[model samples]
Target: VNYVFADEFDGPAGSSPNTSKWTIAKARETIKDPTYWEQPGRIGQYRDDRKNAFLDGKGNLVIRATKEGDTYYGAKLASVWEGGAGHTWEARIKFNCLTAGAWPAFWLGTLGEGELDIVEWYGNGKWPSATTVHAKSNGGEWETHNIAVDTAWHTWRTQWDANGARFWQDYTEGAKPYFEVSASQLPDWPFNQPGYTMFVVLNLAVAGSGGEDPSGGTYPADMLVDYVRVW
Candidate 1:
């Protein structure tokens, strides 16, 4: 229950995220793979500069997505600190644009290990948000819940331990998890590996699995984060 890692994003406006804690990715391949980056469904290209990701000077981190000519630019960030078992990860986030094709996520894990999506909002007019755990054993497990997500901030959280993981919203004592996955269910048990297995990832991706093409929506959409904490 003690602090393990945290970023309040209290920095000057137009500043980049703290390098010691976050790596700003210039390409989708840097975070995942080339095929996934250039996949047909997605329209976004990752950009490492402040034009896509910046601190708003109001204790918030903004990951913006914009379109120029035929290309869409967005931001992606990975935490330097690795996430493992026996801890809780949480974030306060706000989506300024939920237009179709705006795909924003707060998640953990890396390629070939396992992935825990604390929250993924696919702006397809569907009110339900998704929480998923991707295990090598069965591909992935997911749950969707109706949440009145808007521009207002909402808390997304997950608790992970050797036994399993539980997903929550505005976690409180005795509050049941909206979705949960047991370690036993994942025969591979990837969460047991801590050091280089899983880590925090924040991104704003346009198109792809997010739904319809974003060509008809407004540009310069933003996904804001008030903070990210682990315990």
Candidate 2:
């Protein structure tokens, strides 16, 4: 794979993210909808606060989620892709250690290119995270693999080319993929088209959709990112 963008997140210990490299998910867009939810009555909003997404200065990117004055705020970090498509993307991440209300994710594509959710750590405590694919034809498809995501940092990845889009966990050849949707699954909304760029989005979100209830836990939760590599 040809290396394109690589952010080891190397820094001191208490510094902020490299502003020149990462753009804080802010304003009308948090690399996604501000109030997007999948389940009923779940409405979490993304606040354009730089503090929500910062660097640990310890070779890690941290996105925090907190609540203040009846509103929940989260952090989202997006790369400056400049209208380029990425064939492959990999990252090491650890989710917040809570049972409900947390929704941390590492995903590619947005409104344009077919969306590929590399991984989403819903507040499912002991359950595996969520991996999904969203296209124009078929709205979405969920993951089948059930692996504990918050226990520790794990390498998650995805690859998209003329063949299809494949998602997987771990770094071994024998490791089974979470799912790979392509021409068969998404005939009408094929992912092999042109003029679409895959944008990287990392965020730590709170209660909405398939997420846990915010009323149950305390905030200032964290989603630690070790590194990200793209090709």
Candidate 3:
């Protein structure tokens, strides 16, 4: 089947998805909320600039998260076309072994906005990554579901089929499995919207919203993606 590129967020030097091109999507703060800046809470550190990967060699995108001051990095690109949002996103990535405070992820959110963690690191001793869906819910409260994410270079995915949507992990063709996330269980608001095209963001987030900050883990921790194909 023929397809087109939606949002490809190569590193600062301009790599990947593009052999030698890069469009800088402005980085806001440590976490998503612009107000979260300077404000300190247990919620976790806002997204950091140190996480933005500048040099991408080894042909694989290496995103690192660290602790230096309050500095961190996160890079983004807009959708090639508007109204191109989809339910299924398949990416092949391998996350560095997560230790305390170590958080690496492959996620999607409104451009320069909130987060939809397709895959996030959980400090739990468990071996699977965490898949989360966040938004406004009943009584206007933010809620999410934290589940196991793929642990290897698998085709991790989420489908928005009219018959109900869900999260899935495709270790191989036949090995793919789906996790159901009822809209009721998600935030009250809907994730479907125009101007919301697929986006790619890789970062070693410091103590941020997820609450699982590696007290002390491996780093420069890196998140590597072989490719991201959405059909």
Candidate 4:
């Protein structure tokens, strides 16, 4: 594996990461507190992915969720890098299950109305962990194939090649394992095309199409990401 960061990530379950060289990004944050500067994001917006976004501190990228007024919102750093078709990437994360409408995603795609759900573990244990994609072709319809999801930290992988896109479990395993989801079966063959790197946004949204919008469920939820690597 490539050493993306030395401080590394601290996954869920009191997790710790493998990097120390993060230059802490100055994000376009909504809730700003003076004391929150440089401090670890263990609580509040930094902890609630639906409320707060992401705060890169001590090598860990904290994505938080919080409920404000009508509903809760999430926070994450949409990658500054633009990815494309035929590129392989993975994100190692441990999530906390909360409420009914919360959908926290670790995905990548372009903003060209381009929709791609590389790997996402959403909601309670009821919904299927999906490798889904959305598009305007099918009247903005969505298609998904479920996978194994749990409270434990699992390394989810999304690999795109000439044949199409595929989602797999476990990092040590190869890209397209038997238990993988292919893009050829998606809404409009979205993954087969090339894409410019878009922002990597970790959003814990509610009352929207994905989650419980406008405060549908409870507040102060969290989506913990241990480490994310692109190679």
lDDT of 1 by residue, 161-196 (tens): 767888888777899988888877766767766563
Per-residue lDDT of model 2, residues 155-217, tens digit only: 998877656677778868877667776656655554656766767888777766545577777
For model 4, residues 1-231, the per-residue Cα lDDT tens digits are 663212245444332222233222233234335232212232213232212544345444555556555334455455554556555677776666455656677666565654657666545434666776554333366656766567677777766653555566675744445344455554555545554343344445433334423234555566666566666
Task: Write one digit per residue (lDDT tens) for candidate 3, span 143-170.
Answer: 3445654446665676553233466766
lDDT of 2: 0.69
- TM-scores for all candidates? 0.85, 0.80, 0.63, 0.64
TM-score of 4: 0.64
Candidate number of the best lDDT: 1
Q: What is the lDDT of residue 97 in candidate 3?
A: 43
CA lDDT scores, all candidates in order: 0.78, 0.69, 0.49, 0.51
TM-score of 2: 0.80
lDDT (Cα, 0-100) at 178 in candidate 1: 82
Candidate 3 regions with alpha-carbon error over 4 angstroms:
6-56, 67-87, 111-115, 123-129, 135-146, 149-151, 161-163, 171-176, 182-198, 211-215
For TM-score, the strongest prediction is 1
Ordered from best to worst TM-score, the candidate numbers read 1, 2, 4, 3
lDDT of 4: 0.51
Q: Which regions in candidate 1 have their CA more than 4 angstroms from the true location?
A: 30-42, 124-128, 137-148, 193-197
**Which has the higher TM-score value, candidate number 1 or candidate number 3?**
1
